[model samples]
Target: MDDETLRLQFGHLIRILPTLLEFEKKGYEPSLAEIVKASGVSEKTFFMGLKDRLIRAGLVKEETLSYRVKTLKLTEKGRRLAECLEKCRDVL
Candidate 1:
């Protein structure tokens, strides 16, 4: 929740967040397929297990640990953070 927290690599989540924007404008959130693709990481890179961390960081809302994004709505803190992170991706 603060700078003191450990690294939370949500690059892929933020990178493709604009997809939610597009889907949002269409009157709905992203479908499951988009959710899967927005991850940016292939199956091989998924073992890192980010669900718990991201939930604590407010980037993901879930009951179980899929370690994958499962929503369009985020906490205000999460959205702002993701916007900032998306900018970081733009820089790369």
Candidate 2:
């Protein structure tokens, strides 16, 4: 991705991180649909962005239904990354 695209994607991630953290704190395993609703991103954009990040970070996992379902949880690495991102936001 170009620098502009990367910046835009990072901005989206930053915006979405709080929602994910909120769900985690609440002991809720939110569905993709829930995330899309909260993030105001279309289903395609949400899944694509999520899958890209998870795959790149080697944190991709499958949740089983009749068909395999992709669910995102913060890996140890992801958790650390989220913490760093949150701290950065605090300083801004």
Candidate 3:
């Protein structure tokens, strides 16, 4: 990534993406708090570090998390990025 922001956010990419994917795979989108249970990164951190930026970049989306609807449309942008993010892996 060329941009300073992206390179910095990539700091937490592998940490965040899978949580989003797990919720997405389960056909559910969790609230920010739920995400923090494992992500260890608060929503405010995302707001500052990446989330808002990516959304504006058209690479992320967020909406209400409700079990009643039991639905969350994991956008093409989010899904596509997941595959590539696996590049950030533990080598040791």
Candidate 4:
């Protein structure tokens, strides 16, 4: 993968962290479809790269509920990063 292309996709994926953190706090494990829609990220983009990247980065964990169903939760590191983003947003 081109570094430039990967970087762009990574940006899109990182934008998801804050919302995932919020959902986690609400005690909800959101599905890929739900989060993609909520994050305004295209399902194609997510499946193409963002999904694995999030998991690989240790920012999100995927739970398989069935053959076709999956849910996501943030890791402790992810929550911390998301909290930082929230604070920045609050400041701005």
Task: Find the candidate with the highest TM-score and give its number.
Answer: 4
Whole-model lDDT per candidate: 0.52, 0.59, 0.59, 0.74
Candidate 4 error regions (>4 Å): 1-14
lDDT of 4 at 13: 47
What TM-score should be assigned to candidate 2? 0.62
What ranking emerges by lDDT with the best candidate at the front? Answer: 4, 3, 2, 1
What shift in Å separates residue 65 of candidate 2 from its native position after superposition?
Answer: 6.7
After superposition, which runs of candidate 2 have C-alpha atoms over 4 Å from their true positions?
Answer: 1-8, 59-62, 65-70
Model 2 Cα lDDT, one tens digit per residue, 1-92: 33222434666566556556667778877666675677566678766665565446543243542344444566665565566677767877
User: How much is 29 displaced in model 4, in angstroms?
Assistant: 1.6
TM-score of each: 0.55, 0.62, 0.63, 0.77
Question: How far is 32's C-alpha from truth in model 3 (Å)?
Answer: 1.2
Writing each residue's lDDT as its tens digit, candidate 4 over 1-92 gives 33232344434645688778777778887778888877878889889987887777777789985679898777787788778777765665
lDDT of 3 by residue, 18-62 (tens): 667767777766666666566667667865656655555555566
* Model 4 residue 64 distance off true place after TM-score fit, in angstroms: 1.3
Show pairs that collide, candidate 4: none
Query: Which pairs clash in model 2?
Result: none
Error of 3 at 43 (Å): 4.5
